[PDB]
Scaffold this active site. Structure first.
Site, PDB file in Angstrom:
ATOM      1  N   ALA A 186       0.933  -1.165  -0.044  1.00 36.61           N
ATOM      2  CA  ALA A 186      -0.037  -0.116  -0.006  1.00 36.61           C
ATOM      3  C   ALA A 186       1.015   1.072   0.181  1.00 36.61           C
ATOM      4  CB  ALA A 186      -1.097  -0.060   1.241  1.00 36.61           C
ATOM      5  N   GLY A 213       2.789   7.372  -2.933  1.00 36.62           N
ATOM      6  CA  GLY A 213       3.925   7.206  -3.825  1.00 36.62           C
ATOM      7  C   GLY A 213       5.175   7.562  -3.481  1.00 36.62           C
ATOM      8  N   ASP A 251      -1.662  -1.652  -5.253  1.00 39.06           N
ATOM      9  CA  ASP A 251      -2.536  -0.675  -5.212  1.00 39.06           C
ATOM     10  C   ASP A 251      -3.881  -1.197  -5.541  1.00 39.06           C
ATOM     11  N   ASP A 293      -4.750  -7.547  -5.046  1.00 42.84           N
ATOM     12  CA  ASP A 293      -5.390  -7.489  -3.474  1.00 42.84           C
ATOM     13  C   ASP A 293      -3.978  -8.048  -2.964  1.00 42.84           C
ATOM     14  N   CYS A 312      -2.111   4.841  10.153  1.00 43.67           N
ATOM     15  CA  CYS A 312      -2.568   6.096  10.420  1.00 43.67           C
ATOM     16  C   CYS A 312      -3.573   6.169  11.631  1.00 43.67           C
ATOM     17  CB  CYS A 312      -2.907   7.156   9.523  1.00 43.67           C
TER      18      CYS A 312
END
Lengths: 177, 324
Positions: B127, B131, B151, B178, B252
Site C-alpha cells: 500500500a 508513492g 494498489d 489484492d 495512521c
RNA sequence: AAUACAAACCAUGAAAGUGUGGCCUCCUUUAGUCCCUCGAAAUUUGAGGCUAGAGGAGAAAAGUUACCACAGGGAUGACCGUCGUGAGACAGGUUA
RNA sequence: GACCCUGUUGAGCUUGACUCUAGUUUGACAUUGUGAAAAGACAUAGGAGGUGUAGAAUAGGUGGGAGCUUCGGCGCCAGUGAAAUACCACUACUCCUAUUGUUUUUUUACUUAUUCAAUGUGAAGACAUUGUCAGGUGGGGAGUUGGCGGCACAUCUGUGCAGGU
C-alpha cells in the site's frame, strides 16, 4: 503475457534508434547474465530486465497494470509512441543534446515550443528533422522533440522563431495526480 | 464528571459519541484536551529531497534563492526540510517539476526509516498510494534492487505513476492486485512494507470525515481487514536471506483496536515472527494490556506518534523478523 | 381491442330445463438460505458454497463518442502551391 | 457564423471465446557430506515478574471467602478502577543463569555427493547443478463451437409403482 512480435519490435526499434545511438549498450548480456528484455502490456510497452519478467510472469494478465519502466504505447493505426516515461533511458545515452535556459525552460515545462532565445548553448551537426533531447543549464533532462531546422539555419533565422518542436515534458506527471 | 466531559466535548467539537468515548478511555483528559487542540490545528508540510538527484544543502540553497522559508526537521532526518512560507507555488517551481523533491507529511517519513533497504534487495510495498514511500527506499538503496508496489484503485494508481517517473526510480513494478492475493501468486520477498488502511483517526486535519463518519461497523471490519493484510505480510517475507529482511507495519490510527492488537494476533498465531527494536529515536511505549486483553510484554519497543508532543501526524509503526 | 356482466344464438331433451370455453411461463448485476465450511469476535459478524429476479467465429482487429485537427456536403486580407505530418515554413507565385 | 452530417487523424473506454500446454513460473523437498567456529529455537533445575488510566499501590489471571490473625497491620466499609486487595489452591507465559541435553541456521576447511577434463584416470567442489511435487499465467502451439397431452395397448430393462421399442 507475450513479447514483442516481428513488426512490432521493428517499429519500436525504428523509433528508438531515431533517438538512440547505442542500442547494443541498452540491451546486452550483463555480468550476471540478466538482459534488458522488452515487454508490452495492454498495448503499452515497457523496458524491464529478464529477472523482473520471471517474477512478473507468475501473475494473471488483468491483475498486472505496469511493469518496470514504461516506454510508450501503440495507437490503433500501429504507429509507435515514446513518452516522457522513457526520458531517463533516453537522456542516459543521448545522441543530440540541446540546452535551454531557465527563462526558456519554464515555457518548455508549461507546454510551449522552443524559441531561439530559450537555448543557451548548442550541439553540432544536427540535421533538419533529426531527434534530440532537451536539457537545461544544469544538465537536468527536461524533454525531447524534433528540431524545426538544422544547426546552420538556426544561426541565420530570427530569434523569435520556433527552434525545436516540443513533444513531451513533465506536464504528464502533473496531469496524472 | 465523565459523562459531563463527554457531552461538552461532543457538543463543542463535533466528535461522535462512540469515538469520544474511545479517545477519553485511551488518554487522560489533560492529554485528551491537548489532543483535541492538536488535531484541529493544521499540520505543517514537509519536503523530502531526492538523494538520487541532489543533496539537502543544494535544494535548501535553491529554494531560499527562490523565496521558500525552510528549516530542517530535527536531527533524525537528514533528508527532510519544513516549509513555513513560499512566494512561488511549490508545484510550479523548477525543482519540483524536475523532481528534485516531493511533498509529504511526517507520517510518510517514519516507516521507511524504520525499514533498512540495502543494495540489490527485493522489497514489497502492498500500500503505497501517495508513492513517496516507494521512492524513499529507492533513495536509500541508490536504485539497486527490485521493488514491487501494490494498489487497490486505478485512480490513485494513475496518480503515483506520475510521481515515481518524475522522481526517476526506474526499477519498481506497480500494479493492481489484492494484498491478500500477493503472497500466493508471487511470494518470496526479502522485505515487506505495509501501510494498512484504517479509520484515519490519527490525521483528521487532512480527513475531517473521520470525526463523524465512523460507525460501529467500521471499528470491526477494518481491524479484521488489516488482520488478513499482516497475515499476507508474514507469508510474503523470507525467513533466511543473505541480507536480513524485516516486516514493517504502519498505520495512521491512534485507537488500540487498530494498534498493538493485530500485531499481537500475528505474534500469537505464528511463533516464527519475532519483533526487534526499530532503531527509532522518538516514540511512545506500547501498552502491555489495555482492555481486558493480555498482550505479549515484548511490545515496549513498538513505537507510536502523537500530535501534541511533536509536530507530526498520528502514526503507529511496528517491526518484525521472521525465523522459520 | 382485451376483459367482466347481461342478452341473443347454438347443442340436447317430448317437455321440464340443463349446458359450455383449465393451469403455467460460464461469468456479470441483485437478494435470501444467516442453512454448511473457513475465520474473527468474552457469544456477534466477514468471506465462500447453496438458492432465485435479469443479461450475454475470437488475435485478425473491431464497436462507440453533443471530443480534437484536416478536407468535403447541408442550412441560415484568400487561394494554386513546393517542402515535412505528432507540429509548420517560404524571395514561390502572373508583371515591370 | 454558430449548428448538423461524411471521410482521414489522435484522445480514448470496452471487447478480442472455451479446454490443455510450450514459453514459462512461485514455494517447499531430496541429491547435499565430514570437522571447526559461532548464533537462534525447543528438555530441564532455579532467581524475579506484572502501571494506558485512576486507585495510598507495579492490579498476573482463575475458584471460593469475609479475620485464618504471628499484628488489629491490613481484612470489612469506603472511594478509584473491565478486574480490589486478608487468606489458601491452580497455571499461563516473560527477563535471565547454567546445563541435565535435543534440534535448526550461517561461515570456513577438506573431498565422500554433484558436475566437468581425459576418456579406454584427475580436477572445481559441498557454491553451483539435477530430479520431485503443491500453486499462477498462457491471445504463441493443439482441439471444439413457449407450452407440458391422455400410463389407452403389446414386447424388453427395471427385477402395484416405473423406463425403453
Amino acid at each position: 503475457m507475450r513479447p514483442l512480435t516481428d513488426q512490432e519490435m521493428k517499429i519500436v526499434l525504428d523509433k528508438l534508434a531515431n533517438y538512440m545511438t547505442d542500442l547494443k549498450s541498452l540491451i546486452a548480456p550483463l555480468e550476471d547474465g540478466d538482459r534488458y528484455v522488452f515487454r508490452m502490456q495492454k498495448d503499452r510497452v515497457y523496458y524491464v530486465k529478464l529477472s523482473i519478467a520471471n517474477i512478473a510472469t507468475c501473475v494473471a494478465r488483468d491483475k498486472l497494470l505496469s511493469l518496470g519502466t514504461c516506454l510508450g504505447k501503440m495507437t490503433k493505426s500501429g504507429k509507435f509512441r515514446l513518452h516522457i516515461t522513457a526520458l531517463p533511458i533516453l537522456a542516459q545515452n543521448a545522441r543530440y543534446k540541446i540546452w535551454v535556459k531557465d527563462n526558456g525552460a519554464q515555457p518548455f515545462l508549461y507546454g510551449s515550443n522552443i524559441v531561439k532565445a530559450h537555448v543557451g548553448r548548442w550541439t553540432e551537426d544536427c540535421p533538419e528533422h533529426s531527434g534530440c533531447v532537451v536539457y537545461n543549464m544544469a544538465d537536468i533532462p527536461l524533454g525531447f522533440g524534433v528540431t524545426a531546422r538544422s544547426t546552420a539555419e538556426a544561426r541565420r533565422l530570427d530569434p523569435t522563431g520556433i527552434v525545436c518542436f516540443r513533444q513531451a515534458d513533465c506536464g504528464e506527471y502533473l496531469r496524472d495526480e | 464528571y465523565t459523562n459531563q466531559l463527554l457531552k461538552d466535548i461532543c457538543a463543542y467539537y463535533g466528535y461522535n459519541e462512540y469515538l469520544a468515548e474511545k479517545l477519553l478511555n485511551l488518554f487522560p483528559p489533560r492529554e485528551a484536551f491537548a489532543f483535541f487542540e492538536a488535531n484541529e490545528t493544521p499540520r505543517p508540510v514537509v519536503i523530502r529531497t531526492n538523494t538520487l538527484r541532489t543533496h539537502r544543502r543544494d535544494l535548501a540553497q535553491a529554494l531560499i534563492n527562490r523565496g521558500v522559508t525552510l528549516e530542517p526537521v530535527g536531527k533524525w532526518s537528514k533528508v527532510g526540510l519544513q516549509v513555513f512560507d513560499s512566494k512561488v507555488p511549490l508545484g510550479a517551481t523548477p525543482e519540483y517539476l524536475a523532481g528534485h523533491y516531493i511533498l509529504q507529511a511526517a507520517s510518510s517519513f517514519l516507516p521507511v526509516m524504520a525499514l533498512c533497504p540495502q543494495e540489490n534487495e527485493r522489497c514489497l510495498d502492498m500500500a503505497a498510494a501517495p508513492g513517496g514511500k516507494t521512492t524513499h527506499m529507492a533513495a536509500l538503496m541508490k536504485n539497486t534492487g527490485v521493488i514491487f508496489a501494490n494498489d487497490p484503485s486505478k485512480s490513485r494508481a494513475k496518480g503515483l505513476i506520475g510521481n515515481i517517473h518524475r522522481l526517476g526510480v526506474r526499477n519498481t513494478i506497480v500494479c493492481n492486485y489484492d494484498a491478500r492475493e500477493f503472497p500466493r501468486v508471487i511470494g518470496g520477498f526479502d522485505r515487506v512494507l505495509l501501510d494498512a488502511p484504517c479509520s484515519g483517526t490519527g490525521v483528521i486535519c487532512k480527513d475531517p470525515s473521520v470525526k463523524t463518519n465512523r460507525d460501529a461497523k467500521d471499528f470491526m471490519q477494518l481491524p479484521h481487514t488489516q488482520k488478513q493484510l499482516l497475515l499476507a505480510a508474514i507469508d510474503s517475507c523470507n525467513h533466511a536471506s543473505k541480507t536480513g529482511g524485516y516486516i514493517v507495519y504502519s498505520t495512521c490510527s491512534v485507537c488500540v483496536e487498530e494498534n498493538e492488537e493485530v500485531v499481537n494476533y500475528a505474534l500469537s498465531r505464528r511463533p516464527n515472527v519475532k519483533l526487534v527494536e526499530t532503531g527509532l529515536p522518538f516514540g511512545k511505549e506500547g501498552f502491555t494490556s489495555y482492555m481486558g486483553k493480555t498482550f505479549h510484554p515484548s511490545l515496549k519497543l513498538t513505537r507510536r506518534f502523537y500530535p501534541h508532543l511533536y509536530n507530526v501526524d498520528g502514526f503507529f509503526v511496528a517491526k518484525f523478523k521472521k525465523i522459520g
